[PDB]
């Protein structure tokens, strides 16, 4: 009860816009996959986690940081956890410590590829 599977597709969609993390999990695992046909250079996706209020800046700086940095600013302390940027036929998992989430905050997940974040975003709720 401490993982979730998510897909990103060739139509710039995740197949969820919300998941939970139970507060009794010590670690939580996100398993991202790209079952499309377009490569990462034109339709790459990542799962990037931050507070809801930090998502905009993570995205802005990330899009400006280069494909070769997976569209994340180096040493961006607002990023709680993330997967790699993946393309067709690839998958990547991230396991993180739930202690990184505070029960007082609200959290969102998103993709930082150029143009994808307003389409590819969702809520993570710690319950
Ligand atoms: Cu994307």
UniProtKB/Swiss-Prot annotation:
Cross-referenced Pfam families: Copper-bind
Gene from which the chain derives: azu
A single GO cellular-component term on record: periplasmic space
InterPro entries named among the record's database cross-references: Azurin (IPR014068), BlueCu_1 (IPR000923), BlueCu_1_BS (IPR028871), Cu-binding_ET (IPR050845), Cupredoxin (IPR008972)
Location in the cell: Periplasm
Classification of source organism: Bacteria, Pseudomonadati, Pseudomonadota, Gammaproteobacteria, Pseudomonadales
Organism: Pseudomonas aeruginosa (strain ATCC 15692 / DSM 22644 / CIP 104116 / JCM 14847 / LMG 12228 / 1C / PRS 101 / PAO1)
Name assigned to this protein: Azurin
Entry keyword Protein biosynthesis: no
Entry function: Transfers electrons from cytochrome c551 to cytochrome oxidase.
UniProt keyword Secreted present: no
Example of a GO MF term: identical protein binding
Superkingdom as given in the UniProt entry: Bacteria
């Amino acid at each position: 009860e401490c993982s979730v599977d998510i897909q990103g597709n060739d139509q710039m969609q995740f197949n969820t816009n919300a998941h939970t993390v139970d507060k009794s999990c010590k670690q939580f695992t996100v398993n991202l996959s790209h079952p499309g046909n377009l490569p990462k250079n034109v339709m790459g996706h990542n799962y990037v986690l931050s507070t809801a209020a930090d998502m905009q800046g993570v995205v802005t700086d990330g899009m400006a940081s280069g494909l070769d940095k997976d569209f994340l600013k180096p040493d961006d302390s607002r990023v709680i956890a993330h997967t790699k940027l993946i393309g067709s036929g690839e998958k990547d998992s991230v396991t993180f410590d739930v202690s990184k989430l505070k029960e007082g905050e609200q959290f969102m997940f998103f993709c930082t590829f150029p143009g994808h974040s307003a389409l590819m975003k969702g809520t993570l709720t710690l319950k």
